[PDB]
Amino acid sequence: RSVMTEEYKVPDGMVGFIIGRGGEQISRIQQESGCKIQIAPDSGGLPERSCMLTGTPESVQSAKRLLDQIVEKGR
Amino acid sequence: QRSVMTEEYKVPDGMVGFIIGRGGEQISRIQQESGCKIQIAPDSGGLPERSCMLTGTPESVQSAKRLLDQIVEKGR
Amino acid sequence: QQRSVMTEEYKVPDGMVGFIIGRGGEQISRIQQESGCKIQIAPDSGGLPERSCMLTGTPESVQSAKRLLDQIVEKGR
């Protein structure tokens, strides 16, 4: 139940959508999950972009589900 | 020159939004690719160009200019 | 050491995080600029001795960042 940090991956082509205009989408996901979500700035041509998630295990799992939900809306 | 340096640079005012990209994802990426910090002023005050401050080694600063040009050359 | 930018997990001592970041974030801003590496630090270690970081850059930049971070840690408090 202590806070922990996990690596996670999102599609490079969805990063802009995940963050959203004015960062409003990533602010929503962090609030809804109780997780800090930090996204790397560059994939260097690879298909995924690394993220660091920090929260309780329950919050981290929630953040993964919410990120997946955004990706599943596509572009 | 080897050391990091800072200079002024200009981009078209009408390209600023495109350069930054949704969620700032494009400007974050081109800074990482070039090694150059790219700070863009918030307002042109009616002028056609927007001022930017570029900080990096000369090689990084040149790279950033090339990447910015390539974005501008895609237009809208 | 391939050419492309890559992302690595890395760790710094929890008790050094403030010193690494520096007053007004000036130190971490500078070492990122010097190394060419984005250095993202998690906000909380949850009682563990190390704090997770994500380093993004070319292999050469990532190694430079590790050296600069080690140099700061080796100055201690």
UniProtKB/Swiss-Prot annotation, chain A:
Organism superkingdom: Eukaryota
Subcellular localization, as worded in the UniProt entry: Nucleus
Phosphoserine, modified sites: S43
Phosphothreonine modifications at: T56
Domain KH residue range list: 3-67
Post-translational changes noted in the entry: Ubiquitinated. This targets the protein for proteasome-mediated degradation.
Regions that span the bilayer: none
Coiled-coil ranges from the UniProt annotation: none
Quaternary structure and interacting proteins, as annotated: Found in a complex with PUF60 and far upstream element (FUSE) DNA segment. Interacts with PUF60 and JTV1.
Function summary: Regulates MYC expression by binding to a single-stranded far-upstream element (FUSE) upstream of the MYC promoter. May act both as activator and repressor of transcription.
Protein name per UniProt: Far upstream element-binding protein 1
Source organism (scientific name): Homo sapiens (Human)
Lineage start: Eukaryota, Metazoa, Chordata, Craniata, Vertebrata
Annotated gene: FUBP1
